[PDB]
Symmetry: C3
Subunit: 222 residues, 3 copies
Amino acid sequence: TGRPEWIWLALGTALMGLGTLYFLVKGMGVSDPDAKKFYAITTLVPAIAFTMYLSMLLGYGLTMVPFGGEQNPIYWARYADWLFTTPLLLLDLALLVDADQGTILALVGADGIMIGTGLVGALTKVYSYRFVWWAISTAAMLYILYVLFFGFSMRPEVASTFKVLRNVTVVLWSAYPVVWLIGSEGAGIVPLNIETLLFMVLDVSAKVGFGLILLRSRAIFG
Amino acid sequence: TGRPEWIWLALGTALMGLGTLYFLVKGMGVSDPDAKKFYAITTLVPAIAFTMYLSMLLGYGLTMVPFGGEQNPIYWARYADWLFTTPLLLLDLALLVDADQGTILALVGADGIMIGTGLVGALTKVYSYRFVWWAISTAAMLYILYVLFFGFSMRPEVASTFKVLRNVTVVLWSAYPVVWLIGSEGAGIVPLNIETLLFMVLDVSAKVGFGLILLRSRAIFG
Amino acid sequence: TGRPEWIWLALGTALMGLGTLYFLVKGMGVSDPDAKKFYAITTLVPAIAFTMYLSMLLGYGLTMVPFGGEQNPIYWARYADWLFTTPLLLLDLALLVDADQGTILALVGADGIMIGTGLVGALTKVYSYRFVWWAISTAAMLYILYVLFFGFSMRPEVASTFKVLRNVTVVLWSAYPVVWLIGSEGAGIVPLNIETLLFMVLDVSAKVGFGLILLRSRAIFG
Ligand SMILES: CC(C)CCCCCCCCCCCC[C@@H](C)CCCCCCCC(C)C
Ligand SMILES: CC(C)CCCCCCCCCCCC[C@@H](C)CCCCCCCC(C)C
Ligand SMILES: CC(C)CCCCCCCCCCCC[C@@H](C)CCCCCCCC(C)C
Ligand SMILES: *C\C=C(C)/C=C/C=C(C)/C=C/C1=C(C)CCCC1(C)C
Ligand SMILES: *C\C=C(C)/C=C/C=C(C)/C=C/C1=C(C)CCCC1(C)C
Ligand SMILES: *C\C=C(C)/C=C/C=C(C)/C=C/C1=C(C)CCCC1(C)C
């Protein structure tokens, strides 16, 4: 359409949907309860992402926020996505290592704060304050990464899959705050169509890429 | 008041409240933990519905959405209701059959998508796109119905209650997308006071009717 | 800033943050899973409260609501806080007594209704109706207090800590509806800077005060 970034929202919509369908199919047959648990969280992730990608594509998930002397296009639908899919991704990890729910509770609530403060920042109309929220959200992200490495004898099946996925997580996830900082939500350094591409590549990799590594491994089974 | 559908929102408010009070009373005495679990989910359902019915009655849960060349009255409070009560109803079913949480996870997330996409559609200002969201929401509903029948040796107590409730669920729930399609959110075929009546009858049956069948059966006990 | 209540929002921000940091530090070392579970819920509470306090301080968590012939400043961010932290506080209590999840389900859903109806009332533009929602929210609160005393052989460690915390809860929590009634959301009896102070003292006591009593006791351990 009339938004130059439309193409990347369309690609992302498409990629998230085919990823959802693929994992849906693959999960057909599965009766292993544990595996059952990874399939559900892992298919749901790009399915949610599919709908929020679509909502951005169709314009619904877009709003204008005034700040720094301009009317800025903010895709808020990203935070509706992440709010659910980021804890679910952390859920895949906790289960994979069989995390005490006390740690799961810390991960999921730290995540909510991360995203919730992400969202507040996205929509705050006082230019400098946006970066205050970014910082707090970053701190929660840094806490989550802390736990990923430091908050955790696992079955050797689980170990190599866990370490890979954790590696993929820290590298991908750590990129989100940077893109946010220099893109349209932040200093306005990198234009919106480029930011959206960046987020499209991270989003598909962190959900569909992450999911293919998880789901093709017997780490997930009994 | 000045809205012809006021009477059905008042009736629904009333019926949901007396249903809540009745189940509250009935749950008095109960110490069976399992039964405890069905009473809580089952009383909470029309209690939430009570407040959202009230919010529509009082006008709070109503908003105007512009599309197809008119200003359309959309009761958004329905989705605030369903968002919580529909997974809770699916929760009553999963527990009753002792569903693996992997399936519960699939049901509850598919439900969120259903309602969440329902809501997006309700509020989208591009007339044709509303039906895109309707379709996606319908697909999630069809998936849920799939699991209800196909996603599941149960204690014979549970079986006859389960089958009845599942039957009631598929027939009632399948009616919601139709009403949405031809009523005010959709093609505008059936007027708002009639749609609201339809939704009032489905809502009370699916929550209070469903609940009386559940709660008068020993299916729920130990 | 230009809002006389700014000082109490700043104090509260500060106190909630240092409380979060303190509990974070204290939870360092902890490997007891159960204790793990109380630390996470208990640190998360003022961390959420910290961000919502900040959001009010910075003006984001503030909105104008028209009613009774004036434009009223309503801090909605309080309900975004309570929505998560009040069930979490009830969670600390249920676990401490090892509540059946059927009761936990009743507590947490009754809480959601309480806060959710609190919020509807806060934002309703029909002056008299606000007090209808207040009443319904109060009823849910009274139900929760009912369960706290009546909805529940515990390990004697847990007992004296439980009774104290429950006492602190009933007295603090019962004060919130009163402040709401006579303050700016309600009859407008007590000015906003005074209400905000009241809420700041309750909030810190119910979260940080409550948490210090909980976390310095071996009630939380194995
Ligand atoms: C059945 C399988 C293997 C995959 C099909 C699912 C559908 C979606 C695309 C699959 C690709 C996943 C790769 C994850 C990681 C990334 C680094 C990809 C970045 C995305 C950008 C475009 C790349 C091309 C593709 C269209 C596959
Ligand atoms: C104690 C018991 C049995 C019930 C009282 C609870 C209060 C609410 C009404 C109970 C009725 C439930 C029937 C569920 C299914 C439906 C098909 C009903 C459709 C509703 C429309 C009006 C019907 C009349 C009533 C006011 C009972
Ligand atoms: C390490 C410890 C003991 C505490 C430091 C955490 C930081 C925050 C303040 C701690 C105080 C908690 C008291 C809870 C109950 C209340 C009745 C307090 C009402 C608050 C108002 C101001 C009181 C002064 C303070 C700044 C401590
Ligand atoms: C879609 C899946 C991913 C995995 C999205 C992850 C997003 C982060 C980890 C986002 C982080 C942010 C931070 C740390 C700073 C404020 C802005 C963000 C919300 C983008
Ligand atoms: C209140 C309890 C019920 C049981 C409500 C159920 C609603 C559905 C199952 C609603 C479905 C929708 C779909 C499938 C299509 C888009 C519009 C709806 C949200 C009405
Ligand atoms: C921050 C922790 C607390 C413990 C906040 C508690 C708030 C209540 C228990 C709030 C109750 C309300 C009621 C009962 C009546 C309507 C208005 C309120 C939402 C303030």
